[PDB]
Structure 1
Amino acid sequence: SMADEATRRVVSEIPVLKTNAGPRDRELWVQRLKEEYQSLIRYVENNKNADNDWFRLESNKEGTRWFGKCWYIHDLLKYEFDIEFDIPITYPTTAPEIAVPELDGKHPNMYRGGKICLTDHFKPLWARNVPKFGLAHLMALGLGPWLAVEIPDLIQKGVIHHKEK
């Protein structure tokens, strides 16, 4: 299928995850977090080699709340957006909801709180890969393509302005 190949192309070279554990699952959750950090750092390293170093993420000590920044280049200007998400108790079966709080407020493909709205193909894709996909895959298959539609649209519509210096 086209969908299978497109997924393979994007998540090529991102380490797969193993453990089906969420925030309440003690030693198994600690192990899941090692897999999450190992996948994220390899994805970042790959992105640097691709000249597409487009995000940073940090977590709290328990790994249940994540926050950082993403960058998007449009007509050679770089745009920065703060991002954040909580880990659902039923992670990794359930995907986290990424918020871009500065874009909160009646914009296409978003919910209240600035939660990004992904297309319907993302949720079944995630479901059929549990528990192999993690936060690196959420960024690569979720937020990444979202930005490539929504940021150009919001710049064209004069919603987003670049800050001089």
Structure 2
Amino acid sequence: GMADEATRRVVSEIPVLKTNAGPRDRELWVQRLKEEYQSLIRYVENNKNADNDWFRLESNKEGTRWFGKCWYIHDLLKYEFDIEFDIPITYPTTAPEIAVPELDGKTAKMARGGKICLTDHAKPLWARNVPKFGLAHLMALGLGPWLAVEIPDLIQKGVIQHKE
């Protein structure tokens, strides 16, 4: 009830994805990537209009490896972190693990390699929606909220610092 409204509020304007394909699925994967880029770019364009342009992502030729940056603003200071992840073979049933390698071991809510610990509520929400959610949804529902909890906590603990 409140959980559905919370999800719909956060992702309502992100194009939904269609194609149930992973990295090895040839022409279906090429179509999945079109959907992924279509969703990511609309998300960014929406983020710009809302003065919340908070990440850049790109893939390799095959779309098996993604990398870019996210930005978090705290008390008017902008923190930039490099991000990267591999697409699992069983994607998009299986959610990718976003790695922020520079924050590795600096918070408990994180596995080895700076793979962010994705909440017990977010994983089944992804599971129920398959294959409608893509990387745009993973950023909006996964990394977005994680940064809004961990970046402030890390700045306060003095373990993360500001660069020009």
- TM-score grouping bracket, smaller chain normalisation: over 0.9
Cα distance in structure 2, aligned partners of 1:119 and 1:31 = 29
Cα distance in structure 1, aligned partners of 2:72 and 2:107 = 18
Given the two structures, how large is their TM-score scaled by the length of structure 2? 0.99
* 2:20–2:32 Cα contact (<8 Å) kept: yes
Cα distance in structure 2, aligned partners of 1:92 and 1:159 = 34
Which 5+ residue runs of structure 1 have no aligned equivalent?
A: none
* 2:18–2:35 Cα contact (<8 Å) kept: yes
| Alpha-carbon distance, 1:12 to partner | 1.3
| Alpha-carbon distance, 1:108 to partner | 2.1
Instruction: Please give the per-residue CA displacement for 1:48-102, whole angstroms capped at 9, x wherever unaligned.
Output: 0000000000100000100000000000000000000000000000000000000
| Alpha-carbon distance, 1:106 to partner | 4.9
Cα distance in structure 1, aligned partners of 2:106 and 2:70 = 21
Aligned residue-pair number: 164
Cα distance in structure 2, aligned partners of 1:73 and 1:106 = 19
| Alpha-carbon distance, 1:13 to partner | 0.7
| Alpha-carbon distance, 1:118 to partner | 1.7
Runs of 4+ aligned residues of structure 1 deviating over 6 Å after TM superposition are none
SS at match of 1:113: coil
| Alpha-carbon distance, 1:131 to partner | 0.3
SS at match of 1:95: coil
Which 5+ residue runs of structure 2 have no aligned equivalent?
A: none
SS at match of 2:152: helix
* 2:100–2:115 Cα contact (<8 Å) kept: yes
Q: Structure 1's 52 and 106: CA in aligned 2 closer, same or farther, altered over 3 A?
A: closer
Cα distance in structure 1, aligned partners of 2:59 and 2:163 = 28
Q: Structure 1's 81 and 106: CA in aligned 2 closer, same or farther, altered over 3 A?
A: closer
Cα distance in structure 1, aligned partners of 2:92 and 2:81 = 25
Given the two structures, how large is their TM-score scaled by the length of structure 1? 0.98
Match of 1:77 in 2: 77
Instruction: Please give the per-residue CA displacement for 1:21-73, whole angstroms capped at 9, x wherever unaligned.
Output: 00010010000000000000000000000000000001000001000000000
| Alpha-carbon distance, 1:105 to partner | 1.4
Identity %: 96
Instruction: Please give the per-residue CA displacement for 1:131-158, whole angstroms capped at 9, x wherever unaligned.
Output: 0000000000000000000000000000
* 2:106–2:159 Cα contact (<8 Å) kept: no
RMSD: 0.7
Cα distance in structure 2, aligned partners of 1:105 and 1:24 = 32
SS at match of 2:129: coil
Cα distance in structure 2, aligned partners of 1:86 and 1:60 = 10
| Alpha-carbon distance, 1:119 to partner | 1.3
Listed as ranges, the matches of 1:23-102 within 5 Å are 23-102=23-102
| Alpha-carbon distance, 1:107 to partner | 1.6
